[PDB]
């Protein structure tokens, strides 16, 4: 562990075209001092492996506006208009990869495992390949994403993903001891921890350096063996992106969504309806809310004084945690998800098919990436519940035989709650209508649905919390 | 998390035939109260996925004694005479699995990854098949392991390994809060941590239950999402297998050690193998800092402990009680082997029964005599980014060659040894060139080494007398 007092001296030797792993989730755990040294070295050609594209005026968005990156490898690249500009113009190469695949690939690369199978992306364009990585000035495609090998194990289908290593890792942490051991604060750990392990040279910036012996040996997050270069950064803006401080049919879906929660349940809730449904959780039960950036035990939104840039949800909103909460890295978070340990994933959808295909991450000709959306639907052991308005404009269907928008997952939905009905959904049997909004008939449902469905013989009216 | 006061109740529904994941490394972090509960229920036919076989009177050894295990999946099964009687007689099936592969399959099992590739086992019985799983009454093999799928990535060969999941995991931890978050003490983490994630029903025993909020949210080793059933154990013997406290044929062995000590450099991360390599750590200059890594989940090993410092929760890979230095860390067995498998350790130093001309190593099996497992040895020699030095006596009994053209004992690794230190010679080892004799114990000539070595070798023009750390 070499200690440096110049952030430029820490990164002088990054050759043009390097692959650099960049820590951070949204603007949370961004190595803003090392990323500033790169603006100051002006190094170029880079392939940046980074979960997100920062924002325009911050994070990796800074090396983008200064044209220093050839290729971004990310999972979610929204909230950066300049990255959209460079991609569509053919100035930027972009590889979108599921978030949990991103985390596991980087981890694999650090752990000496050249490839592994994941259920995530099967039956989607991740498996199929062919999507533009790079356009020409024509609008013709200079680079297409390669297909992934599909293989079956114990009933389910999986795809082969290859490890990611880097030449360098730019990592932000909380404190280092003088031996080079490092800890991370709150949800700021995310991709920083695994990215420490997967590069030939890791550069870590910390907020503070402490003595050898300050950390309990059991509580070291990154052992010194992974830390090659260390600086204490001179300045930290730490800029909250979304400072989040404490219709008829939408409330209906919500008051029904709220009845999905049970005592002892581990749940991951998408932004919008599912998250709002959690406000109606009885205090006589406990639900444990998981966040993909590495939090179990999310609490309500923070009061003004409680807002902390190191604690955010997957929506990028400032959050709090309840007593009993835990933090963990992005690779551990997706092991929990991909492994089926979450009980309930509640999600929005643009389309759901008869046998449970879900389209929710991409509209052709309208370009943000999938995030953890594919990972959250990939486990058979986790109940997937979609909450959505029943129909689009013009009564255009959203429940159909075959989705026509790109799939998030194949045969992954277990139930659909709309303002008109609740359907159970099966891979092989299709839809059963188990509940119908009072006043409406089955034929009012049939006429706004794009496929056949069974009706439950215990078919009750629609419940409301 | 459901809390139980009755440990028999928490394991009462394990069915006959179950696959059970059992934590612990040696006798360290063994779920002793949960093992006792399985003795009370008498559940049989089990497949036990467990790193070692305890000892005769402790750990998994107790369930071997009561004949409740039909099959074992382990990396190292020595120091248990009842195990060896059951295995060799044909009563027990044993899948000897490299330790880091066992760690990563279990973690894969918890992580929803059905299969992955690893370099560990390539070039060995693990990859080619033929490892004995079950013996016949007459000592022939009834069941041998099958060939693994082999695949090349980036000019290296790897083998495909599948996830391991259990019906149940029996997990020892240190403390749990009342939400069911869990922490581990010292090197007692080991396999307990990943096994907690890889079973349909995980049962954890802890020594103390504390209040929600007694753990910083950053320092919860197992979040509550993984803990299904929790008990506070009634009694903890916490036996020590080897009380090794700080202080025959040592003449030529001191030679090897004083030369091997010169392989260390300031700032080096090293993993030292059982046997001779441990002893050269004492000869590491106090003018430098070497960082010593233990496969059971430690970085920054210190000296052997004074009596009053010895702790059952802190051992090395030789199952000896050890200490840690300031700046040390602890981590799980999957993370330990990610460090090793990923090439982050600078030097590995190992014993050998044989080394071949091109760097193959044989150090884990003597067919028909010694079948105790490879432990972490195959993993330690798996990385191209790590220097592998063998420390050994030059020749075997009867001046039988140990350095030879091809090994006759099952391989631990193919083309993996970089240097061989003996009491007569130091060889550099190239996978295409062969051996070069770079150092020679003064007073011996080159014909003395050739008459003791079972193959030819180049002689360095800068050949010098063999170095000894002053």
Curated annotation (Swiss-Prot), chain A:
- Modified-residue entries (N6-succinyllysine), positions: 146, 366, 368, 402
Keyword annotations from UniProtKB, A to Z: Disease variant, Lipid metabolism, Mitochondrion, Phosphoprotein, Transferase, Transit peptide
Q: What is the effect of changing residue 176 to V?
A: In SCOTD; partial loss of activity
Superkingdom is Eukaryota
Q: In which tissues is it expressed?
A: Abundant in heart, followed in order by brain, kidney, skeletal muscle, and lung, whereas in liver it is undetectable. Expressed (at protein level) in all tissues (except in liver), most abundant in myocardium, then brain, kidney, adrenal glands, skeletal muscle and lung; also detectable in leukocytes and fibroblasts.
| Record PTM Phosphoserine, positions in chain | 131
Q: Which Pfam families match?
A: CoA_trans (PF01144)
What's a GO cellular component annotated to this UniProt protein?
mitochondrion
* Active site residues per record: 292
State which pathway it belongs to. Ketone metabolism; succinyl-CoA degradation; acetoacetyl-CoA from succinyl-CoA: step 1/1
Q: What class of enzyme is it?
A: transferase
Task: Please name the GO terms that the record assigns under molecular function.
Answer: identical protein binding; succinyl-CoA:3-oxo-acid CoA-transferase activity
Outcome of substituting residue 352 to F:
In SCOTD; loss of activity
What is known about its subunit structure?
Homodimer. Only one subunit is competent to transfer the CoA moiety to the acceptor carboxylate (3-oxo acid).
Family from the record: Belongs to the 3-oxoacid CoA-transferase family.
Name by which UniProt lists this protein: Succinyl-CoA:3-ketoacid coenzyme A transferase 1, mitochondrial
Native species of this protein? Homo sapiens (Human)
């Amino acid at each position: 562990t070499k200690f440096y007092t110049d952030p430029v001296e820490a990164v002088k030797d990054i050759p043009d075209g390097a692959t650099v792993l960049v820590g951070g989730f949204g603007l949370c755990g961004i190595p803003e001092n090392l990323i500033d040294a790169l603006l100051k070295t002006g190094v170029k050609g880079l392939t940046a492996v980074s979960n997100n594209a920062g924002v325009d005026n911050f994070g990796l968005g800074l090396l983008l506006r200064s044209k220093q990156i050839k290729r971004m490898v990310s999972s979610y690249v929204g909230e950066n208009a300049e990255f959209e500009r460079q991609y569509l113009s053919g100035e930027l190469e972009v590889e979108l990869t599921p978030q949990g695949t991103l985390a596991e690939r980087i981890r694999a690369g650090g752990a000496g495992v050249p490839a592994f199978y994941t259920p995530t992306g099967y039956g989607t364009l991740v498996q199929e390949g062919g999507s533009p990585i790079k356009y020409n000035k024509d609008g013709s495609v200079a680079i297409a994403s390669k297909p992934r090998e599909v293989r079956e194990f114990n009933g389910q289908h999986f795809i082969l993903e290859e490890a990611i290593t880097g030449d360098f890792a730019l990592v932000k942490a909380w404190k280092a001891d003088r031996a080079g051991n490092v800890i991370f604060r709150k949800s700021a750990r995310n991709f920083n921890l695994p990215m420490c392990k997967a590069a030939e040279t890791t550069v870590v910036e910390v907020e503070e350096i402490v003595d050898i012996g300050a950390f309990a040996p059991e509580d070291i997050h990154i052992p010194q063996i992974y830390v090659h270069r260390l600086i204490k950064g001179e300045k930290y803006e730490k800029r909250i992106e979304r400072l989040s401080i404490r219709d008829d049919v939408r409330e209906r879906i919500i008051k029904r969504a709220a009845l999905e929660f049970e005592d002892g349940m581990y749940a991951n809730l998408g932004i919008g309806i599912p998250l709002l449904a959690s406000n109606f959780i009885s205090p006589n039960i406990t639900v444990h809310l998981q966040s993909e950036n590495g939090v179990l035990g999310l609490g309500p939104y923070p009061r003004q004084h409680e807002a902390d840039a190191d604690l955010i949800n997957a929506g990028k909103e400032t959050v709090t945690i309840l007593p009993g909460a835990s933090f963990f890295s992005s690779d551990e978070s997706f092991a929990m998800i991909r492994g089926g340990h979450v009980d309930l994933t509640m999600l929005g959808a643009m389309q759901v098919s008869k046998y449970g295909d879900l389209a929710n991450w991409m509209i052709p000709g309208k370009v943000k990436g999938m995030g953890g959306a594919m990972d959250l639907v990939s486990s058979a052991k986790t109940k997937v519940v979609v909450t959505m308005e029943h129909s689009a404009k013009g009564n255009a269907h959203k429940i159909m035989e075959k989705c026509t928008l790109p799939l998030t997952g194949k045969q992954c939905v277990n139930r659909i709650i709309t303002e008109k009905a609740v359907f159970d959904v099966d891979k092989k049997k299709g839809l059963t209508l188990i509940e119908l909004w009072e006043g409406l008939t089955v034929d009012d449902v049939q006429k706004s649905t794009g496929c056949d469905f069974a009706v439950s013989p215990k078919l009750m009216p629609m419940q409301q919390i």
